[model samples]
Target chain A: LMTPYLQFNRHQWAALRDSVPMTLTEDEITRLKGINEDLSLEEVAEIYLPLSRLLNFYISSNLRRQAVLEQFLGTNGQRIPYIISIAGSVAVGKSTTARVLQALLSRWPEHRHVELITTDGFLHPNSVLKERGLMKKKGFPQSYDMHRLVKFVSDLKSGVPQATAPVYSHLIYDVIPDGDKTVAQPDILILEGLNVLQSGMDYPHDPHHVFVSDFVDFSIYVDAPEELLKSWYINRFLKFREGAFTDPDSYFHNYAKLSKEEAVDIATSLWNEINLMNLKENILPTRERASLIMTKSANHSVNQVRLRK
Target chain B: LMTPYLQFNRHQWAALRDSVPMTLTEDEITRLKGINEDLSLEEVAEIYLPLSRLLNFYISSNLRRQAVLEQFLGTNGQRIPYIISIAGSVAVGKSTTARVLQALLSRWPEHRHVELITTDGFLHPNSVLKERGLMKKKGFPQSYDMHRLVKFVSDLKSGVPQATAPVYSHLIYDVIPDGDKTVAQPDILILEGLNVLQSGMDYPHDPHHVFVSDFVDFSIYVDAPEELLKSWYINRFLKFREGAFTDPDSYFHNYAKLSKEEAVDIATSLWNEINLMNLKENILPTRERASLIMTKSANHSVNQVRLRK
Candidate 1:
């Protein structure tokens, strides 16, 4: 039998939080926090401070290994950046985790250059999805330009001076034309997506295929119970209805006129029909593939931390 | 981050061994032991005792659930047999695990009709593999008659009164002509293979395709370090040269004329070229899919056990 991992509950994890020094100011935390996310300084001190310290340790260890490799090859080329992937179900606060990590990692003197990119930009344009009649499977693995995504990460890992990635707009729900973000030899790169850990389901046994995860140096999976995710998703839908949906330029502006009950019903159905299916079939199954997992309570507070050996 | 599995070392696991009763006799243990395996009565008591107990608990719980389902559906026709799959690298002693489990599970009055089968029997004839120029990939996924194997398991699960499975001959290294084993309504069925846990690799995202693991009620992966497996393979080859390889009808008859060192060199190369590649590319990646994993030490003793929650 394989040796199991060491698990830590909330209080047990919190006990180690003090060992890592807090670097984020209250104002900085507010800026890093997501619109619907309930991340506070107390939560960060208890959860993310220790997490950031652990990441720093991993980063330093990776750098030491890279230096040894460069010496062995007798080449002192530019050091390759560490790639960290964050994956979770929709509305599970993974975006907040990514944003917060990017901020915390960038603040460290050793990690002065940190870049955060979402795989959402790699998603096929709305026109392409509609042409292929795959609009219903928007967030599924098949709906993304995986070949391009794989090449982008491959280029980044190959120590390219500058790599450009397409930018996506949630307001328009499509890729922005002529809007490319440039990443220039960052010390660390954070890639966040709903299905970042998925190992290309279409080629389960093909050894020749390259998966997006093939370039990942470390991976994190943010997790919550199904019922909690459902409630959170519904809550986010209601918030969007009064916020983003009310804007004339928003893709979901039609939902702005919906009654609260109708909006809740539609959100529940959408979650059940699409998001829930994607989570169960594609996302949740890849959770075990992650190097670290953060399990949250119903209130969006991380209650447990599990690290793979 | 995904929550990692809880692991237990051998000593920690042995402490809980007394909770289950040992059912195997000395003769049965000898019968179940593999050619190069060192499984003794003491080892069985320390390791497989608790394992059998855990399997029994799962069986009982599954039976209770089946009863509930039958009551809800208002049908009491036939109780479906539970199928357990065992997967591991070649020469990793997966067959021994399956045989031992079959013996222990059958001794239980509740599971008196347990049966064990190997997917090796489902492999295509050597002639067919040669026709496809896939002789070099004999044990690979494509070399198996997967469609027939899937249908056979499906029929068994559908409560077929008697299912016939093709048999293979190690002497000829080919499928036996008109040699079929009949399974008649077994209470429990154990399927052992190198690639039993493999999902349909070509159609990874397609839920419509059926893989062998799809019908598995439980799965176990036998694991070991690659270096240890290499030594074990070479050792097994040396033993076979003096024993089975001496037979004129043996597929490896030419190996009998080789010197000990020559045999070792050939075995090492074969392992490095074929077995190792198949294992790394196809087998080892499926380890996390198992419900339980047995990790062996260099001496072939199980050093740790991991159970997925």
Candidate 2:
């Protein structure tokens, strides 16, 4: 009840989403879905279409403010890129949302140069975490180099001609050394991560560093019940056993040979011991800080929406 | 350093304020000044004029959002009152800022019905505090009935036809029994208080009630260094000793007969023991949550402005 957000249930939200034209094809929707994510054309039209429109409204409003500032400064107005952040717990479908937003925003005539980046790339190498005994705390705020991330966003906001971000390989489950993704003055950037909305207090060291959200123009938090998240995490684990886990280079190769019941037990323990702790201690606390929150049901359909008023 | 606000020095801020014309005359400026405040026409033209214009921008933006929501609901939009919160330490010149904003905003033809209310009116009577053995903790969050304050703002936001608030008397140092201020639907309301921006944690009970800021459309924090605030507090206390403290009903009437040095010592101890502690623990931490902040120099002129991007 202390929240500043305006809440809407599924039927009410769908009513508001009415008449918004669907733009994505079946092929594009299939490509955007994660291995265990259940996304369909109907869900897209009911949820993501209206969300994209809302983002468009925010982007245009920000552009107007920029133009007004430049006029006040009496200088040629330089185009400033808008940054949208998507944050949520593991297995909450934040990545799918980010990808869909990037795809939809790029197709819009006003934002042709949309780019997507994940904060996983900014995470320190596994060796560093292992050396510092932070291996067990992976995905926590302290596991990433926040200074570098802040600088990258700061440089982008300052209109740098070009910027490079490290590359992360999910199959390998580590940052790729000497690998980078470069961008040149994109109109929009979507950053997705588990801890994007965290403030300084969440990290023990560098208590004075600016939060990643400082550079964000808009943000969305994907939310679901903890029990559903546990099931989804286990489901994703089962799928990975037949896919990436079978690869020799994959970090989870050992899990490929585990029996189905054994793998389920391991996944359940890991979810309870680590991911749940991080979710309760760090990620969920930042949900109220987001510009909007999308709540999903067990069926993976967004059933509620809360927008900050 | 963790603040999300973008800082601007006096010169840069003044440059941005260059073209905004001053709406208040010399007489109005003088009338808006606090007893111990040092405000000149130069300061008003350079700082307050620009601030008024910025508030104008926010008011219009909020109106647009309201219109969009009404259109989405397929109904004719009804006017909703905008609430601006002004917060700072006890002697940080927040009242002056609130008064100046109220006066200037009223002059805007579109906002002729601007209204100002102070949270002091919601404070529990001295008898209650004494009965509860919380006399020393007066002015802290628990000293006010937050439920009442929240309901007041909630009703205002909901377009209540008329709302009544308690009336506080500085001369009596208490709430006037049966005395009330009736507010009819106004275009804008200004809520001024020392702890208006505090979170739910500040109030021990009623953890589920929404914060006063949750209903605020915009907020301003008046800021100064600790040393300057101490001096200002002492200065104001000395003035009160010569004025209101002489009243027989004034709670601080006993301090009226003290020598100037004695009064200074008392004021310093009060600031260090109580006010400063509250400022650091409950007030300063909320500074970054403001829409904008005004930093004051030792001479009481605004030396900088920090706006949330």
Candidate 3:
């Protein structure tokens, strides 16, 4: 078998966090933690410190190459943004991983201008999905306005002065009208999403010019077993019954008062009927496309790190 | 007295060339050398190797700082050019040093885009100088359009997309009309000129906004004794009598067939009346302003390197 990646277990990966400084505090980690996940300095130090060290080296190496190439061509060479991406299943805590990496990267002087952008804002509005009769397929590839997302990333990477992203409010589960946030001149941008790693090349006769993964300098995938994913999704949904979903304005308010047995049935149906189907059909198959993959265990801690060689 | 500079003799300075690579060939140096100077790779290995190494580190250091600053401000930082200037007396071989240093610096990836732009083109045309009754003060500060020259450097340093510079032809002794050279996004720039070091702050009534030296990151001055400078000018002028000056369309063709004795008298007068006068009154006074001063010997070789602390 051909190996494009060098595989490492958790213990081996933690040792590689040798050179980079451990700059994160327990206090900061608490603030950057995910809604359903607990973050600690030990995990941050073991996982993210090594990743940042390797990437700082990578960035400087590129700057020197680009510096020389500009002269050889006798022109100011076109500089594209250095983008790192996080892609995975919805309940695997991709958000937590993205935030932790962002905090670690921002400590470096060259990476201080690092911006964290998520594809949630690039999702098509509920109104549009409902009108198109695709409400059940919300997190599917078709649920995103891929062309607009591609254009936005394209504009920023090509050094356009400024570009705006549509804003999404998860409470209402909709893209708010006139909610556009502008960004410019990013030194490093960490883009996180569920299906960012997905490509249409597997479908013959694709019409798009570029994929989001094409702009990614470091491609990352956060992975867990299918049963573990379903377990996490159902558990998170149970907690949502008594929390955010209970609110009047919540998107899932209909499930707010459902009995325990019925709640379990509906949550599993949401997983089996939607999220699980999408992950199996669309997300898991693209795991090999990632340059780096972090595999999570039953307890939600990273158990393995596989880096593409 | 404040000694902001550390003075080093040739041996001491050459010892600091340890970390840099010796990639230049005698053939390359010979091609890049001046008309009068005989360049040897050994001398270059001793002198320029150390300077380029120091500057390459300086350039990368700034790049990291600028990258971080852009993030703190949450904006793409307004980048400016990093310019190094070489200014010296006429016939002291500033051109030779500039070219030799240019060839050596081009070896570095960051310094490859380093352009060698001379200030000769900024000089007023012969007709303009003669019409303004400044024929006797041709190389003096008044012989330049200080506004346009200052503006040119400002535009380039300010990261303007495209900037044009007027071209100068010494054989015609005038600016070649419509000679607008454009440059963009320079990594490093080396500007050389006779009076580039000169400043007009002593003239309290002057209305110029900025000086050329203000834009230079590293200001270098080539030094020599007045008598040695006079000897070099006289010898160079004698060679021209039988060579370049003999061309029918040459600016100095009138003196092409002058007797050796008469040639000596005119050359001496040219040095004493014009070149020497400009050097003593203008160029020599600005040596203290330079970040580095390179003292030359009677044989037109660098004997000492003094770098600002």
Candidate 4:
């Protein structure tokens, strides 16, 4: 029997961009968060340009079908926003991928009102997690208010006029107070997170829980080998330990006082104890469920893409 | 916007049984556990006989495809059991449904070597659960040894000739010591439990965990409205309160001395705190995920069957 996926190498996927031109410049790419030094405009043109083209086709085809339905029903229906999800392990450059896709897709004529949302907004406040004695499992599925998150997506898919999601900040490493972000109706929305593609169903699965996946029109899971992901995660943490954690207002301000050896040990231990556990137990396991799986090379380039048939 | 399911009333579904003759008598049905007094040979003809016919078709066609493949591969591969799952809330009569299906399905010409397995055995030991402070959440998803349960199903689906499941006893309300039940290869396996159809994946979904759903050939969700299921559960508990709890070896032996009012209060509390919470939070939501959903009337009769397209 045939597998339910179609794989494409980087070259083949890039060719599918066809007439799509590069719209993002080096300067524009510089401002994107988590941008590696090697994120050339050529890489963007090769990877995200093709992905953006594909999403544009999806959006247009969906709109065409809706228009046909409207004429048949003799009633103009509200256009539901196209939802795209990006899921990956920590430090896998998924944020950069989401940012690049957002820029490139917004450049398309069909739907320019593209917006982004991160699952960070849906995480339980540190106070709640702390009181619940779940601080060690921050990125695990149990760490979030899944009901609130699931309900938010459900309401959005129902074409509600507005939906509000709480805001979480890395500065204090907690949910910000009164920091609700209202998502007005948009042409496209990109939801990015470690567990975005998760089915949100547990054993004897709960059917009543409307998972974030139910509303997603398209999804991409950025993937790399475990070794690469681990190295990247630790390296990223080391950078943040010396830089962001040095700030007085940062959650890890105390960590700045540690020696370089202690810092390295702490980063590796954190990745080992917390982040890696989350990836293996929750995040990495969801890779196959995505509409597209993008594999990354050592230099942070997408080497291959697989689309589910 | 067509729904991906086909709905049939009892009358329509019964008609589809076509030429299939009843092989079960009222005397045979009496041996089935939890056999409601209303269950008759007529009810079997109307409900279970049709289901068996449908399942027979599924098994024969599957065997045919395997034969075709065996020829193409030039090898006679081992035959995999056709696994059927029965899922529902506690006291929703899923056990009775499984028993009926097993008896009816076994008499079919295509495959007669049938065996039954209940997920009760996969639950955590009472000693283990008590130590974890999870006695109150016994029926919740966390209360079970999900990894072991999922792995057992995975092995069975892989055609493992001799797989062992630890036995559980209702008398002691815990998994028995070294109570091994060996399932040799069979033509059909009836796996029954409250959460059999569960995906075993949680948010952000684990792609790595192979859910019991992956191994299932067909699944039936026994469903009824909350009020009816609650009444049935409470009524059933009352029977146990008087009938079984009086035994000195029984788990609830101490409850034998309770007055009717106290017994009623405890039964209602257990339902509300444990069984009902599990139903609402975990089990009931998964009804739509089943291949066939059998909705029950107040009289414990399956009134409607919905088959997924």
Candidate 5:
């Protein structure tokens, strides 16, 4: 019988690093090192590798079985596509997870044309959002073009290749007018967002209806204590204050004048008022839906997983 | 070599159907028939099952690839999830697509825990939309809770499973109070909405963000000529007039007294003035990003798919 649960210690995991190996390329490793300057290859290997492999197994089995059923039903030609969602609090290394998984999944022989799609494409134009008085609650999930997100996913599963999704530039903090990212048919897809598990359906059989968690496959929760995340968030903010905030065109340009103590206070207040509130009321409450939970250490590395079934 | 294009005439598809010798199981055939009373099993199989299988293949490949990559990267212990998005015009069968896909994907052995998420959960409360002077543009891309959507998808991708998406009610035509839906990790997920593909980061990366389509794994666009879609929209409105409009508390009671001709004209006008404008200015432009396009025939069946190489 399969093991009911899989457990490991830090020492055991560290020892297996050589056998499991690391997936981050030298360039990626170099880049990540520059960010934190502390992530070891062993951390990447024993920690992330096993979790990635497990997710792949789950995803593959899910797809293969679905294919078989469709074949049996003879409806294989016209069906909706599959979606997998990745979500967590801010500063949880979701971008790193998405990038690493995208690269890794593409390498899997079973999945050709693996693609990674982010939620940044569904935002409305900055002008429209500003006109609509939604600039303040921008990342609160209400400011997006929900209808477009629904339609885009629907069309993808319907097999319409060459669909375009709007683009958003983080530096500018607004959706680009007429800027979009194109998605081609891919064997595997990875979707990352902060609130992929929300559910709301207003109309009868309405197309513009969704509970974010409704379309997830193999969901994961990247977790750490709030204190750690807050610190990480502050540190990142501080780094941005020194770098990106100095840019004339940057959204954070106004923050450059804050003193170090003020900056810390500002970061903390922002977290408490915006991000932390969202995490408690909107994000953290949805943890039950994850197939696997990745608990991160204070330093922002995976330490353990809580798997469902 | 990979085939550049796969096309089939009705007769060819029919012949292939005969050759496959596959039939829905007794239970499945019954359920398929039960869901929509008029459609036949052969039609269902040809139109839906094949697509389901295709999606299965895609999802399976996605999972398998992620696993391999995790192993390669030594992050196999970390969960790498996937995201899929759906989009379409109003009354264009996107809801059916989400539901059918959810049911079918769930039957697949590998993806038994399939979840279908609709974007309606993130809609601002009707009162809030009204307060924001967005009552008229309820279905427009600008009227949704973009930040919430972004945060939701972000959290899902961040590997948080205990996420809950807001819920909406068809009877009320607005987000419901305390009706949030939670999604656990699953093998497959279906994200359905009109603007699910719209993006928030138009200019560049910034701390303030809006929208949620950047996190999609695959996007689908359902198309029909504007005239046909307009007619469908009008017809659906008429259907609603007889049902929800008759309720004493219904806000749409204004339409209850309209003659057939008046109702048609009003519906058409709404479609043209609001729906059509949104489609032209906002929705249609994003069609270029989809991995596949499903074009519907006049009779509401899929006509063809435009796949991207």
Candidate 6:
């Protein structure tokens, strides 16, 4: 087994081989090994569980203090909620992180009533964004309905009787106007979105054009080498090609029949021209602001955590 | 004065003092030091910054991956937003955590256009909850408008235009009818509330009834010993008595003339009856679920971080 405090500069993170071997059960190992680059319970437990617990402390404490503030201010009936932001680049296991954190957090007794909302639901309808000639900025901050997102967060944290957030469906890739998610007196709320930490372009002291990060109680960033992330992105596409992409209703059906070589080329090109560039320009620079940094290895295990302290 | 890689234990944690102690400049110390602790820049940098970064990574990455999933499923238009939950006991500095995070995250270029939202806006109008006999359950999960809260998150994540959340006023301690906060797209979003992560009475596995943690990209739980928190609560109340509570229109104006002993008694009683119970029953139990656990010293500085991995 690898020591827990392995240094990133000297240690190789791509292969688990004996350095920091996975501690998954035999069944879990079998399951993980069956899927190419699948996540393992050991990975989740060793990395994510600790991370989730840390986040829970920050989130829950924030809510409680806000409640006290309201009471102290004689606004006991009012609610001043806390905000949290998550940011990172593509193909760095951010989705897995979110899913795992949500699952783990829900199991916590205090935050079991918690909810996990994603910014995907906040993205402008594809037609609307595309029509506005903002397709290239799809993952950029400009491609969303800023007003609605801000209002939703403000309301949720305000502790009103009822608060609603919009919902978007990945299956349909569009916002269903009637679809709205409610947040009861949840002990915590989790929001995930691309470019969730993009600072606004306004007067230095202006708060009106606030972005998602401005409202967060805590923020996290996932880190990895560009080449490894690019490879993972290409590989993920390859996996999808044989699965969802072949479906007639799938948006990417056109690429389903591409030969393996052709698919690799396409994925790489997309990564190089768009995703990678976005990471370098819009995503990577934000790393300095993250409260906690989870650095991934080639095998997708979190090799190190660079906390702000 | 503390070892950077101390063992994960309370003893080790205790040994770890704040890198920069919570000391005010000599000029400011004479006036404010008698009231309460003041945080140092290093303390904020080491503690809140890392925590914020972690949240940012979790959120942004989740959104991007969800979008990718939507694209793979041929639903590129579906973008479900990510949600983060914050929970903790009273006097745990959760509100301060939220505000500090908001300010710090705004400094980051990526998430500068962020929004810091709290759950205060979602509380049922105090009068309405009292009329419905839910006043006793205030801050309890059952006291909220469950349906509306769910709808809000759903709609916000749905990425629908024109989506909005209800507005709440601290002065009136009630929901502002016909007044809602509209969210446009933002780089980041923060949602803070009490009982946000509380579990349901029973595990129904119903996704609809799940709390905000269900949708969170990350979560946090702030913690302190009951006694320490109680002292802080009383101290804060005393501070407020001399400040905002004295304002003529302030709801807490009645407490302005209370003797120190009376104020302490009231504060202690409130803590024992409400805040302490909530901490034991709702907040503390969720600490295990956090991504990063922040243990605070009595002085209010983060003593140590218990990361999952």
Q: By lDDT, who's the top model here?
A: 2
Best by DockQ: 2
lDDT, candidate 3, at A173: 72
TM-score of 3: 0.49
lDDT of 5 by residue, A1-309 (tens): 222123455544444444444456788667545544555656656665655555556666756665654454344454233556677887777767776666556555676466666676676666777888866555566666666776565556546765677777766777777677787766666777776654332111232333344344567767778988898888878887777555977766667777889988998888888888778866776565465667888566676866542
Q: What CAPRI grade goes to candidate 1?
A: incorrect
B-chain TM-scores per prediction: 0.92, 0.91, 0.91, 0.92, 0.85, 0.77
Interface RMSD of each: 18.0, 5.8, 24.8, 11.3, 12.6, 21.8
Q: Considering lDDT, where higher is better, how would the candidates rank from best to worst? A: 2, 1, 4, 3, 5, 6
DockQ of each: 0.04, 0.16, 0.01, 0.07, 0.03, 0.02
Candidate that would win on TM-score = 2
What is the clash count for each candidate, in the order shown? Answer: 18, 0, 1, 7, 197, 237
Report the lDDT tens digits of candidate 2 across residue range A1-309: 333456778777777675454467666666656422566767877777778877877777666655565545434433558999999998898888898888777767778899899999998899998999988787888888878888788778666777899978867778999999998879999999988887655664765234576577788999999999999899888877768554877766778877889989998998999899999988897786677899988779898898765
- Cα lDDT tens digits for candidate 6, A1-309: 211121322122222123233344666445444443477667765666556655655555555544433332223244444455667777787766776666666665656666677777777888888888866666655666766777676556445556677788755557878898887646556777656655433112232233455356667778899878988888877776766554867545657777778878988988888778788866786665465677888688777775431
Better of 4 and 6 by lDDT: 4
Cα error of candidate 3 at position B234, Å: 1.3
lDDT of each: 0.76, 0.78, 0.71, 0.74, 0.64, 0.59
**Ten-residue stretch with the least lDDT total in model 4 chain B:** B201-210
Ranked candidates, highest DockQ first: 2, 4, 1, 5, 6, 3
- Residue B159, candidate 5: how far off, in angstroms? 3.7
Better candidate number, 1 or 3, judged by lDDT: 1
TM-score of chain B of 6: 0.77
After the best TM-score superposition of candidate 1, give how far the Cα of residue B12 lies from its true spot, in angstroms. 48
